[PDB]
Structure 1
Amino acid sequence: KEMPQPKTFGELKNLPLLNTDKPVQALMKIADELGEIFKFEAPGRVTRYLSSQRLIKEACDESRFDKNLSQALKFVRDFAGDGLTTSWTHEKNWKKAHNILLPSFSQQAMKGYHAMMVDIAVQLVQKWERLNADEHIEVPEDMTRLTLDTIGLCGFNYRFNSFYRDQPHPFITSMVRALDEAMNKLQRANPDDPAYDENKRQFQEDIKVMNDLVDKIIADRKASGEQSDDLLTHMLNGKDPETGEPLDDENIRYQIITFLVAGHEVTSGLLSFALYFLVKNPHVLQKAAEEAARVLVDPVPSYKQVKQLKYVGMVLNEALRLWPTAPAFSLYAKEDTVLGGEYPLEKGDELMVLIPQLHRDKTIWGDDVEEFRPERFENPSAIPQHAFKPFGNGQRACIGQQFALHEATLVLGMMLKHFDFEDHTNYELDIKETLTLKPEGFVVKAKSKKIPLL
């Protein structure tokens, strides 16, 4: 089969289609038009966007395909270095860091982080308890305060104190601006044009800011000798069972930057979308609120109670189905192979997995794919293989999946226990795209149920 291709712009091929405010949603519309696979060409680049479970289940075969760094990840590597997400699988630092960090990210390690996650979750609840009657909540803004603070505390015992300020932390200003520059280079038809020279100068200054601030955090911890149960201690003390080597200080810095990128808007996007879908689906909200009240019987949730918030876990998975906040990942063929029995690929050929479109495959989910129905996730054995991939695939899957879902389940549970919510503006969904997705301008009113935290 010859695969389709969207409209072209002469020598720029398909590249101008990405010069738009919402490229992921633009790619989803192209997929709707062209189907489960289409070719996408730019100067010096060819990739193929996959959207059906039929083809993606083959792409997830790790004997045939390995993780590729998309152009986006290549630009993020300019400041995330060989941290886990921007490393190639064959780089020595990928497997070393993966072996060392896996026990820090397990379901068992979440027991150790739980107290710190509660610390920040309680600050969010108290903020909302303290609003006056006429005020509202800026949802993505507050969810990002929560997730940033949680990863700072669990990551290296650092308090960003986001609920005490309007103006972001200096590290975050550079990190957000670096991510902004990474996404902007994707959309430049002529990136060598001198009008981008201070953009490039600014990008180099932001890299130096992040590096110096994180390096000081590491030097300060080594100097004090204190042993906290955070990711920094584990990286300073851990040894890779295979090579027997610890991480070096440069790589630890890259891992910290990587966790901070991941724990910022990618996780807060999930909480924002989940609350959006709950207020748009009051019957689902009521069921989740009933579970929260039945399970969260103590003033602050325990680790074990968060594990019992099963329906809230389903709400979060259904929010990830519709708007996965890391919406794509890239693969390359390790050898010549045939995809779906119709599309021959040569060694090195690249694939993009378009996750939001995969998650709308009507042959998997039925006709009602656009509806928010957490009950789809009652039994993971009833979901076909590779139909649901919001955390990536295989050995390159998200190491932070348990962390993100524990944090999100805890805080959504507390939110549902402590407040009734009003969609007071009848908010129209507007998905702002960076390298992640979020519902821009989403606002609600939260009326306290006046249940104490003591």
Structure 2
Amino acid sequence: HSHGLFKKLGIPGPTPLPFLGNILSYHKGFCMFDMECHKKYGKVWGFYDGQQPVLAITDPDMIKTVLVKECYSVFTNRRPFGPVGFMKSAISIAEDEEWKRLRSLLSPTFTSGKLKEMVPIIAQYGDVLVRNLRREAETGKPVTLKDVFGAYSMDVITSTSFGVNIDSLNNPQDPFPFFLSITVFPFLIPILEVLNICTNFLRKSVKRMKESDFLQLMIDSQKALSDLELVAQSIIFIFAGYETTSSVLSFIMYELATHPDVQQKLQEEIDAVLPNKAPPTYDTVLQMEYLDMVVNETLRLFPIAMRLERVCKKDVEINGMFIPKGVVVMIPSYALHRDPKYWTEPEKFLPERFSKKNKDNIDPYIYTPFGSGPRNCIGMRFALMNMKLALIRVLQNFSFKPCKETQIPLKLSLGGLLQPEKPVVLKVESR
């Protein structure tokens, strides 16, 4: 019934099938859908996830309008996500006024100082990361990167926010389809919101963080903060600092392997700023510009978010286009990062895109790997530091080459989340 909203507004888009909308088109993944749609319809198009209208925009001013200018007023919240349960109070899932309070309460966790407090602490598990890697390198056995990176990433997040120290080769107490049917049956979300389909593992263990850091800064600031809400924020932070940190690290190492000129040119800078394999510090990391380039260029090819979303909470007319209340506005971050109308040879890995000679010819509303505006990635600065500190210690000791079973070229997960089809396996040699 509601499948004529874009036929009405004169906005092009793929013809939706009843009930399904255009979800059958996701058979190649969200990214191949947005890339094709970006070609088919232009700067603006609209489709339907079930009965839910999605408006895709690609205009830098419209994107600046949505994510920044009209954030607090109209585009405060993301698509409703359920069933969540108590996790409705998580910052990334909370809406309107409740989200504003959580954003203020958790913002001072990633100040330039609180991050600088974390550099002496992060410098530990990188040496566990090297020593765990020196074992699988002295034996000529190819290495699953996400295993030893995730083992590292998990070690970082548990201490940077709480303080628990665990080598992630022994028992790691941290375990963690149908979401398609959720889009045809979003009416089933409130259904599952009563049968408590939301494990009690950390729901009582992290709840029993009696402690009698991020965990410190929460009870210290407790219209204040709750406790079951404190657990939910811990779950969000623990996931992000693990999966996002590890997945991107595998992405970077795959590119350094298939582009050995970029791997050596980066190794030459690390030994320069840090001679005699010096331990990386807060200020020596921010000095390395080629490392910043390699990180940014990998995030162009693999923005793990793929899409930025905002629910339009009332009728508006942004940049000369009427947008009705309830529409989910979408920024195809993946399709924008590979749009040839902005990037030269956009499928190629070229870190020189982000050189200070060329970093000005890049629109920060086309390149948006961390979002933008008041609801951008809250851990953007931390994640950049945690990854870079990891990249320094690893490349200071090991080089990386492709293996026989290394998937070249890498296929993206044609499924839901931005991951590789096959895991990233590379040979590791010792310098």
1:431 correspondence with 2:409? no
User: Which residue in 2 is equivalent to 1:447?
Assistant: 429
Deviation per residue, 1:284-303 (Å, 9 max, x gap): 11211111111222443222
User: Which residue in 2 is equivalent to 1:420?
Assistant: 399
**Structure 1 124/419 Cα, relative in aligned 2: closer, same or farther at 3 Å?**
same
1:212 correspondence with 2:204? yes
**Structure 1 146/432 Cα, relative in aligned 2: closer, same or farther at 3 Å?**
farther
Deviation per residue, 1:173-217 (Å, 9 max, x gap): 2xx2xxx76x4554667996xxx99xx98944x2x3341222012
Query: What CA distance in whole angstroms lies between the structure 1 residues aligned with 2:416 and 2:147?
Result: 17
User: Which residue in 2 is equivalent to 1:122?
Assistant: 127
**Structure 1 9/44 Cα, relative in aligned 2: closer, same or farther at 3 Å?**
closer
Query: What CA distance in whole angstroms lies between the structure 2 residues aligned with 1:42 and 1:275?
Result: 35
Alignment of 1:77-156 (within 5 A): 77-78=84-85, 80-91=87-98, 94-131=99-136, 132-156=138-162
Unpaired runs of 5+ residues, structure 2, are: 1-8
Query: Match for 2:221 among 238, 242, 252?
Result: 238
Aligned positions, number: 412
> What is the identity percentage for the equivalent residue pairs of Structure 1 and Structure 2?
26
Query: Match for 1:401 among 366, 380, 392?
Result: 380
1:111 CA displacement? 1.0
CA contact (8 A) 1:66 1:89 kept: no
User: Which residue in 2 is equivalent to 1:261?
Assistant: 239
TM-score scaled to structure 2, two decimals?
0.86
1:359 CA displacement? 1.4
Query: What CA distance in whole angstroms lies between the structure 1 residues aligned with 2:38 and 2:397?
Result: 41
1:313 CA displacement? 1.3
Deviation per residue, 1:331-383 (Å, 9 max, x gap): 13355333453x42124432011111121233333x32222122222345442
Deviation per residue, 1:34-71 (Å, 9 max, x gap): 33332121444111123454642333343264233225
Alignment of 1:50-449 (within 5 A): 50-53=57-60, 55-63=62-70, 65-71=74-80, 74-75=81-82, 77-78=84-85, 80-91=87-98, 94-131=99-136, 132-165=138-171, 168-169=172-173, 172-173=174-175, 176=176, 183=179, 185-186=181-182, 203-204=197-198, 206=199, 208-217=200-209, 220-221=210-211, 224=212, 230-238=213-221, 246-297=224-275, 298-341=277-320, 343-365=321-343, 367-379=344-356, 380-425=359-404, 426-428=406-408, 429-432=410-413, 436-439=417-420, 440-449=422-431
CA contact (8 A) 2:86 2:229 kept: no
CA RMSD of aligned residues (A): 2.9
Query: What CA distance in whole angstroms lies between the structure 1 residues aligned with 2:415 and 2:382?
Result: 22
Instruction: Give the residue type in structure 2 aligned to 1:441.
Output: P
1:396 CA displacement? 0.6
3-state SS, counterpart of residue 39 of structure 1: strand
1:160 CA displacement? 4.6
3-state SS, counterpart of residue 127 of structure 2: helix
Query: What CA distance in whole angstroms lies between the structure 1 residues aligned with 2:139 and 2:256?
Result: 22
TM-score scaled to structure 1, two decimals?
0.82
Unpaired runs of 5+ residues, structure 1, are: 225-229, 240-244, 450-454
User: Which residue in 1 is equivalent to 2:43?
Assistant: 36
40-49 vs 305-314, greater mean Cα deviation: 40-49
Instruction: Give the residue type in structure 2 aligned to 1:389.
Output: T
